[PDB]
A paper describes a structure:
RBP, via its second and third SH3 domain, is known to bind synaptic ligands such as Ca2+ channels and RIM. Drosophila RBP SH3-II and -III share 49.2% sequence identity and adopt the canonical fold of SH3 domains. We observed the classical poly-proline helix that allows for mainly hydrophobic protein-peptide interaction in all three structures. In summary, we find that the SH3-II and -III interaction surface of RBP serves as a multi-functional platform for differential protein interaction with either other AZ components or the transport adaptor and therefore, motor-cargo linkage.
Residue numbers in the entry:
A (entry chain A): 1317 to 1381
B (entry chain a): 1686 to 1697
Write the structure that this text describes.
Amino acid sequence: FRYFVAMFDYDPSTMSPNPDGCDEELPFQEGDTIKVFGDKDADGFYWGELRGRRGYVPHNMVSEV
Amino acid sequence: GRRLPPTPSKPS
């Protein structure tokens, strides 16, 4: 598992181009540390956990430690 | 397939 730090606030309800993003993409504020498992997928998203919840994370919003 | 949100303005 790798840690990424959020560089931006992200609210998938209002900011995701995916109409399903609200249930499947993780919500985060700047400075949040995300548990990412595996590698970036073909779509550009990581798989991870934050505050006990799992979902997808856009790579252009986070930076690997 | 799954789409990325736009990369915004500036880092912090």
